[PDB]
C-alpha cells in the first residue's frame, strides 16, 4: 500500500545481499573523508614545499602510496557492482522458479510470450540503480552532513535556513516522482507487449509470408515501437526537468541568506554554501531512479503471490492401482460459461477405452483435467473410491504419460527430447525400444547419427510424419500404468498405425489406456466407447452394441463408412 | 576490418541523428566554457560582493537568473537523450524490416527464439553510450586541450611532459578495450541464448509438466543464469581496472616534473595538473564503453548483410493462368544432402490433383518448394513452359492459398486471423461466406461474438479441431488461383470433411487444387493421384488405373481397405 515496502522486502529475499554492501559503502565512506580533506591540506602542504626537493621525494612516495588508496575507491565500486550483479542474479532465479510452478490456468490468460521479458528486461532496469546511484546517495548524505557541520554559524546560530532547503525541494520532487512512477510502469509494461509481439509472430514466418503479411506485420512492429518507445521520451522530458527545479529551491536558500544578514562571517559563509550543489544533484537523482525502479518491479511483485499449484503434499498413498471414475463432475474453462455437463463414467482398468467426439465437444479438456491441471468446480475425480487430490498434486502425474492434440517438441536434440521424464536412469540401451515401439527407429537410423540429429525451434528439422511419432515415444518410454494417446492419426501413415497398434497392445494389457481418435475406425475394438456431445455423453457400451442397441446418432459411424464404401466398387 | 568504421556506418543508415545533435553539442560546448570561467569570476565577484548588501542584492539577483540559465544545460541533456532515443529507435526500425524480408532458409539453420532478443536487449546498451558519456567525450576533450594550453610556458619550451600523459595511457588502454570488446560479444550472445531458451519453454508449459521437468528445466534456467550472468561480472572486474592503470600513467607524469623540470609558476603548475584528473577519467570511460557497445553491435551488423530475398524485381504480375509443371526437379534441404530425386510431374490445371505418400516422404517439402520458399538447386519449376522465377518472387504467393501441416495462428481475434488476405478491404459482408465454405460459422456464432473472441498464443483458446478449420478459412478467403490443402483430415471430424469437400467443389471448378491427404479414401476421385517415396515419384494417372496397372504396392490402398472393412462385420 506504500509502493515502497514490498520492494525492499523483495530484494531482502535474496539473502546474500547483506554480505558486502555495508562493507562496500564503508570503504566508500572513508573515500569521502579523504576527498573532503585533501583540498584543505594541499594549500598548507604546498606552503611546506618552499624547497620541495628533499621532502618532495618522500611526499612523492607518499602521494604515490596515497593515490593508490585513492584508486582503492574502484575496489568499492567493483564490490558495489558485484553485490548488485548478485541481487539481479537471485532476483532472476527466484522469479524463474516461481514462473513455472504456478497453475496452467494462469497461462491461459496472461499470454506467456509477453511474460518472458519480465525476466530479462524487468530486472535489468534495477541494475543501473543498484550500482551507481546508490554510491551517489551514500557519497551525498555524508557530504551534506559533512557540509553544515563546518557551517557552525549556520547549524547553531543561524539555523532557520538550513531546514528550509529540504522540505521545499522534496515538495517539488514528489509530483516528479509520481509522474515518473507512472512512466516506468508503462515502459516495462510495453516492452513485454513488444517482445511478446515478436515471439507470437517471428517463429511463425512460414505463415507471415502470405504475400501481404510482411507489409502488415512490418506495420504492427513499427506502430509497436515508434508510437510507444520513442514516446518514452516522456520519461526523458521529466528526467531533465529536475535540473532547474532542484536549482530553484537552492536559489530560494540564497534569497533567505541575504534577507537575514556579521559582515566578516557571511563572506566565507557564502563560499561554504556554494559547496552543497553537487551533493544535492546526486541525492535528487537517487529518488528519481528509485521510484523509476519500482515501476519496473510493480508488475513483477504480483506474480510472486500466485498459488504454486504443484506441491509435494502426497499424504500417504501413491501406488495402489485401481480404476478411475468421474462422479457428476463438470468443469469450466471460464468460471461462468462452463463447457462440460456433469460427466459420469467409469474407466475399467486392464481394458482400453476410447472417447470419440465431433469437433466442438469436450474431448480435450477431459484429458486436461484428468491430469489435474484444473481441479474442476462441480463434481470430483476418484480412483479406488478415494479422492485423487489426496494422492498428490503433481507427483501423481509421473505415473501417467501424455500427448496433446498437437505433438510439441523442444529445441534440444532428439535425445534430450525423450529423456527428462525419468531424468535419472535414461538407460541408453532402452531408448531404442521405445523408438521401436513408436515405429521411430526405421526412419531415424537413416538420419545422421540420431544423438547428433537436431530439431529446429518447434521441430521444423523433423517433419510432421516424424514429429507425431517421436512425441509418443515420450509416453511409451516413461513406462506408465495410465496412458493417453491423443491423436493416433494426426500426422502419420497407416503403415505407422498398424505397427503402433500392434506394438502398444503388447505392453498395455494390465495397464489401462485412454485414447481418442479422429476417425472411429482406429479404436472400434476397445472394451468401451464414450460419445461426448457438447459436454454430455449419450452413449456407452461396446461399439458393436452401440450400433444396434442405441440409436441417438446411428450414423456418426455411418458417416465414416459411406466415405470408405467407394473403395470397393472402383477397385473390384 | 577495423571493427569501428561499420559502427559509424550502422548509425549513419539511421538518418535523423545528425539533425539536432550539433545544437546539442554546441550547448555542451558553451556549458564547458561557462564551467571554465565560473571560478575566475567568483573569486573576484566576492571582492565586489564584499560591499554591503545594498549593492550585492542588485548583482545577486542577476547571478540568480544566471544560475537558471546555468540550468539550461539540463535541456541539453534532454537533447542528447532525445537524439539518443531517436538513434536507438532507428536501429530497431531498420533491424526489424530487414528481419522479415530475408529468405526463410535463414530462419531454420539459425533459431528464431535466439534472434528475437537482438531487437530489444541488443540496442538498449547503445543508449547508455549515446546519452551521457558522449557529452563527457566532448566536455573532456575541450577541457584537456584548454587546460594544457593554459601551461603557456610548458607547451612551447618544456613540452616533454605533455607528450607522455595521453599516449602512454592509450598504450595501457589497448588491452582493456580488447578484453572489454570480447566480453560484449559474449554477454550479448548469451542474453540472446537466455531469452531464446525461455520463449521455447513457457509456451509449451503443458509438456514441461512431465512431473519431473519442473525440477530439471528449472535447473537449465539456473545453469543458464548463474553460471553465465553472475559470471558476467567478469567485465565489472576489468571495468574497475581502468582506475589503477590510469593512475600509474599520470603519476609517471607526476615524477616527470622533477625528471626534467627540476632545473627551472612551479606551484601553479602543480595546481593545474591536479585538475586534468576528472576530464581524463571521463574521456577514458567513454573509450571503455565504446568497446563495450561495439561488441554488443558487431553481431548486430551481420544480420543487416543478408540477401533480403523478397523484392518486386519480378517484372510480371501473373494475370494469366496455365498449368503447373515440374521439370526434372531435385531439391536438397542442405547443399550437400538432398531429399528429392529428379522428380517429373505435370499439375493439370482447373481440375483437382493430389499427392499421397508415406510418413517422412517428400510430400510437404514439395509444397514448400512449389511455394518457392527455396528455389531448388537443380532442375526448374515452370508453368505454361515459362519458369516461375522470371515472374516475381512473392507476388505469385498472393494467388496461392496455403494451410500448413500444423495449424498456425497469429495471436489476436479470429476475425483478424483471416482479415489480412487482401489486407485492405476485408469487406465484413462475406467473411462468413468464407467461413461457410469452411464449415466454421455453425461452430462460431454460438461463441461470444466472433470478432470479440480472441485466440491465445498458438490458438490455445480454441480447439485443435477448431484451429484447423479456422486456418482453412484464410485459404478460401483469398479466392486464389491455386489452392493448397495440406492436412484435410488432421484435426476435424466426418461431419466436417463432408460439408468441407462438398463446399470446395462448387467454388473450384475451373480453379486447380493441389491437396495431400492421409487416408486415401478422401482423394479417390481426383483426376491424378501421385505417389511419392523417399524423394522419388512412382505413380501417375487415376487411382483406379494406378491400382492394378502399376506394381509397386497393390496393397497401399488395401492398407486401409482391410482396416476399414471391419466396421460392417
Ligand atoms: C544551487 C544553484 N547553483 C548552482 C547549480 C548548478 O546546478 C548544476 C546542475 C547540473 N546538473 C546535475 C544533474 C550540472 C551539470 C551543473 C550545475 C552547475 C554548473 C553549471 C555550469 C558550470 C558549472 C556548474 C557547477 O556546478 O560548478 C559551480 C562552480 C550549477 C552551478 C551552480 C552555481
Ligand atoms: C591518476 C591517479 N589519480 C587520481 C585518480 C582518480 O581516479 C578517479 C577515478 C574515478 N572514476 C572515473 C570513472 C573517480 C570517480 C574519481 C577518481 C579520483 C578521485 C577519487 C576520490 C576523490 C576525488 C577524486 C578526484 O578525481 O579528485 C582529485 C582532486 C581520482 C583521484 C586521483 C588523484
Ligand atoms: N480455452 C479453451 N480451452 C479448451 N477448450 C475450450 C476453450 N474455449 C472453448 N473450449 C471448448 O472446449 C473444447 C475443447 O476441445 P477438444 O480438446 O475437445 O479438442 P479435440 O479433442 O481435438 O476435439 P475437436 O475436434 O473438438 O477439436 C472445444 O470444443 C471448445 O469448444
Ligand atoms: N527442416 C526440414 N525441412 C525439410 N526436411 C527435413 C527438415 N528436417 C528434417 N527433414 C527430413 O526431411 C524429410 C522430409 O520430410 P517432409 O517434411 O517432406 O515430411 P512430410 O512430407 O511432412 O511427411 P508427412 O506428410 O508424412 O508428415 C524427413 O524425413 C526429415 O527426416
Ligand atoms: Mg485434447
Ligand atoms: Mg508433410
UniProtKB/Swiss-Prot annotation, chain B:
Keywords: Antibiotic resistance, ATP-binding, Cell membrane, Membrane, Nucleotide-binding, Translocase, Transmembrane, Transmembrane helix, Transport. One of its GO terms (cellular component) is plasma membrane. It is a multi-pass membrane protein. InterPro entries: AAA+_ATPase, ABC1_TM_dom, ABC1_TM_sf, ABC_transporter-like_ATP-bd, ABC_transporter-like_CS, P-loop_NTPase, Type_1_exporter. The keyword Cell cycle does not apply. One of its GO terms (biological process) is transmembrane transport. It is found in: Cell membrane. Residues 21-292 form the ABC transmembrane type-1 domain. Changing residue 363 to A: Complete loss of ATPase activity. This is Multidrug resistance ABC transporter ATP-binding/permease protein BmrA. It comes from Bacillus subtilis (strain 168). The lineage of its organism: Bacteria, Bacillati, Bacillota, Bacilli, Bacillales.
